[PDB]
């Protein structure tokens with residue numbers, strides 16, 4: 532891991548803030564824009580291990596759809612992790628603020644990028660456990676990159692994860708909820724939810740259903756309905772990600788292949804799944 536001298540880093544604007552540090556937009560020494568995450572003095576041994584552990588994991592990866600680590604400051608205080616800066620922020624908020632502004636082909640291209648990053652992680656034997664649009668970042672080329680790495684810190688730090696242990700119920704596969712079995716196949720389930728988030732421009736999965744109601748619905752066989760304006764092939768793929776039996780789900784290699792083929796023959800995306808209206812408007 533590259534050790535960066537603190538003189539090389541200029542923090543400029545807060546883009547995120549927790550109890551034990553903040554995330555900043557800044558510049559790294561022409562200077563390049565970076566994101567900078569800090570850990571304030573007084574941190575515990577566990578906080579230090581978790582904090583630097585995220586950088587340790589990220590430093591092992593080199594892929595277009597995985598957030599790139601620039602370096603760390605560990606000799607001086609506060610400690611910092613420095614990464615590339617993703618100008619458009621988190622994917623969930625991005626889509627909610629840009630409702631209806633993209634083509635279907637653009638949305639599917641986002642999903643292909645996410646799937647390629649996840650294929651790489653799975654092949655590298657890294658189980659994400661918290662794949663969700665809120666943990667994808669977007670740059671000024673519309674490239675989506677997987678973020679949020681670590682061991683216990685990932686689910687501990689995510690407010691959407693509630694007390695299995697602490698898990699983000701609406702994104703989590705049944706076996707991970709029931710018996711704590713997190714694998715690349717549970718990440719595939721989560722990817723199906725991400726597909727639904729993207730195609731709905733950031734709708735909250737299951738809407739207002741409670742966590743217990745979501746689990747009951749899934750166990751009874753119910754699944755999220757098709758988004759409006761959703762290609763049939765895309766809805767079919769997300770439904771395959773949500774198979775109860777883990778072994779029946781596609782692997783990320785299969786997902787990447789299908790999405791690639793759909794993008795290469797974009798007319799395939801013009802066939803839409805039927806949308807079930809929740810409102811009836813009748814006029815004579």
Ligand SMILES: Cc1cccc(Cl)c1NC(=O)c1cnc(Nc2cccc(C(=O)N[C@H]3CC[C@H](O)CC3)c2)s1
Nearest residue numbers: 546547566567568598612614615616617620621678679
């Ligand atoms: C710095 C760093 C350290 C460890 C791991 C990682 Cl992945 C990173 N890098 C980053 O966090 C980021 C890289 N680029 C980023 N761009 C960016 C720009 C603008 C807003 C956000 C962002 O995440 N905003 C959040 C702030 C929290 C609120 O819920 C609203 C949504 C992110 S964050």
